[PDB]
Amino acid sequence: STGSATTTPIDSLDDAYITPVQIGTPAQTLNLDFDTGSSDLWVFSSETTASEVDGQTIYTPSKSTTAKLLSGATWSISYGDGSSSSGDVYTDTVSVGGLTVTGQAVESAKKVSSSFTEDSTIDGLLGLAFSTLNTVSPTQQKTFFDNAKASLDSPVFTADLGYHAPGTYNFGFIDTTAYTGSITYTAVSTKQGFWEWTSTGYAVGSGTFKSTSIDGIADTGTTLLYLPATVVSAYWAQVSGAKSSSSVGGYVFPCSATLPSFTFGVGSARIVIPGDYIDFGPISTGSSSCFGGIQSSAGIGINIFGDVALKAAFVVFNGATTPTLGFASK
Template sequence: MKVTNTAAAIAAYVLCCRDLVSAGPVQKRGVLDPLFEITTLGGMTFKISQVPNKKFYGQRKGRGSMAIARAYSKYGAAISDDLLSTIEEILKELGLLGNDGAGNNTTADPQGEVAAVPQMFDSEYLCPVEIGTPPQTLNLDFDTGSSDLWVFSSETPSIQVMGQDAWDIEQSSTAKLQTGESWAISYGDGSSSSGNVYLDKVSVGGVTVQNQAVESASNVSVSFTQRPDTDGLLGLAFGSINTVKPTQQKTFFENAVSDLASPLFTANLRKAEPGNYNFGFIDTTEFTGQITFVPVNSSSGFWQFTSEGYSIAGSSAVSAPHEAIADTGTTLLLLPQEIADAYYSQVQGAVNDVSGAGGYVFPCSASLPDYTAMIGSHQAVIPGDFINFAPVDGDTFEDATTCFGGIQASPANFPLAIYGDIFLKAQFVVFHGGNNELGFANKPL
C-alpha cells in the first residue's frame, strides 16, 4: 500500500498490530446470584472462553511505542512527532516501512511480519459472533470503549480485505438495508471506516437479537485492513456514542439485556492465559472477596467511574481523585501524568523517554512495585510484574535491557484516565447495565 507521508504510514500501522485471542465454545448456565438476591433461571446466560489465536501477525520490538500510539489515536489525541519518528525507525528496522523511490513511505504486506507469542503481549480478545440467516460466523473484538457493531462485508473493496472473513450480505435472507442510514468512525491518525447500515439477526453465545444494527464497511481504514484475523468490532459502551446517522442504534448488549437472566456482563481477562466474558450472570468462582460496586457516569457514553487515589508498593494511600474509563479495547493503563510520575519515581532507573520510546521505560532488571487503585472501598491491586509490558531493545524480555511500562500518562488535555487491559487482567469486573454500575473484585492471578 502506498501512502503519501511518513506520519500517515506510521499511524496507519500502529493501529493494526496487536496480539489476538479468539473465543472458544460457549456454555449456557444458570446460577444463584447472591449479590442481587435473585435466581437467574428465567433468562439466558452464556460464557465466552478465550483461547490463543495461532494466526496472529505482529512484531515484538516496539510493542510499547505502538501500544501508546494506538491508545492516543483511538481517543483522538495527537501523536507527537518524536513518537512518530521513533515508530518510523522501528518499522524500517523490521522491514515494515520502506520508500518506493519517489519519496513516498510504504508499509509491508502483513504476511511478512514477524509472528509474536500471544501470551507475551496479550492485548486484544476476539469472540465468535453469528450474523444473518443462515448464520455466518465472524470473529469480533469486544470493545467496552466504543459502541458500533461493524464488520468487513461483501461491500468492502477487495483491496481492503487481507485475510478477514467478510459478512456476505446477499447470502442472508434476513438482512434489511436501512435506506438513508450510514456510519463513520474517525481515528486520531486521520484514517476512518464507514459504510451502510443493515438490520439482521445477530447471535452471541446463544442469545439472539433479531433486528440488530450491523454496520457494513464500504471503506476500512488501513489500521483494520492490516489486522487479518479481526473481522470487525462489537462495541459494548453506551449507545449514545454510536456513530450511525441520522438515527443512532443500540448496542448488542442494550438490545439483548431484556433476554439475559441479569442485566450485566463480566470481563475476566487473564495474563498469559485464556480469560472469558460472561453475559447474564456472575460466576462466584472467578473472584475472591466481595465485589465493590461504584456508580457509572454514562454521560460521555463510556463506562466512566471515579478512582479516589492510589498507593504504591503497599504504602499509605494518596488522595488523587480522577475520572476513568474501563476499556477492554485499550492495552495500557493510562493515568494522570502526576500519578504516572509518582509510580516511576519508585522504579530505579526509570525515565520518561517521550522523544524515544514514547513513554516511561526502565531497566528490564528493575523490580516493579505493585500499583493499587482506590475505587470506592475497593483496593484494586495490579502486581508489578503485570506492569512490565514489553521489551524496547530486543525481541524478548530475555534479550532486552530496556523495558516499556504498562502504566503510562493519559493524553494531555484528555479529561479521562483509561483503565485498559493492564488493569483489567488483574481484576474481575462487572459491567452492570441495570444499575448503571461497575463492580470490581480481586481474583486469583
C-alpha cells in the first residue's frame, strides 16, 4: 500500500504545516501537524476542556462506530518549545492520503496549553519519530508509520515541504519526479528516539564550505533551524545590522536586508537554503526588525534541522531495519 497527502503552511510565514487526516467511522477529518520529532498522535476532542478550545476541529469518539476506549490508558507530553497536552486514549481507524491503519492509538486531549488553544489552525499532532518516545501509559503505543510499515510497498515516508506553498507527505514510495539529482543517504542514530544524523558542514552565501560534524535531528514539527552558536554567529555576521537580542529571544535583522543563503552538507552532497527561507518577518506587527530563521541551539541541548532546512530538500525517512535519512535537492 501507499498514501499521499498534501501539507499546507498554516500562515504566510510557514510557521507550521497541516495535513488532513481521517479518523473514525464515518470519517472525521482533522488537520494535524506531522511531527518527525515526536511520537504521539493526539487530537483536540469532545473531551478537551471547553475554555481551551478556540476554533479547532474536534474528534468526537462517541460518534465513531470504530472507536474503542483504551482502558486505563493516559498520555501527557511536553514539547521542546514549552507547550504541552494530555488526556486519554482511543483506538480507531486512521487514514492519511488513502493509507489506512486500523486500531491506531488516537490520544484524545483533555487539556492543552495556551499555545495550542491560541492556534486555531492545528487540530493536533501526528508523531513520526520512533515509537520509543510515545507517552501513553501504562502501555506504550505505536506511531501511525510503525503501524503502517509492514503493509507499505517500501518502509519509508517522505517529506516535501513547500516554501510559502503546499507540499506533500508520501508513505510507502519515493516519488522520483519530486526532486532533482540523486538522494544522498546518511546514517541515523535512534538512541534518543529521533531521526538523528550528522551533517558534514556548512557554508554561508557564496562562502567556502566548512567541513565539520554537526549532529542534529530532522524535525518537521520545529519551524526554524537551530545550530551551534559558532555556526549561527558566522551566518548573521554576513547580514548588516543583525544582532542577537536577549529581549526578543534570538537573532533579529533589519527587514530591509537581503539575506544570504545557507548550505548544509549531507555526506558529499549539499543542500542550499535560499536566503528568503530564513526571513520570519517583523518581530511584532509593524516593526522594521525581523526575526531570523537560523537560531542558536545553545540553550536546547540538541541541534534541530527544522522546517527552514527541510523545506529546501526532498527528505526520505527510511524505516528499514536499520533506519537512514535521505536528502535530495529539488
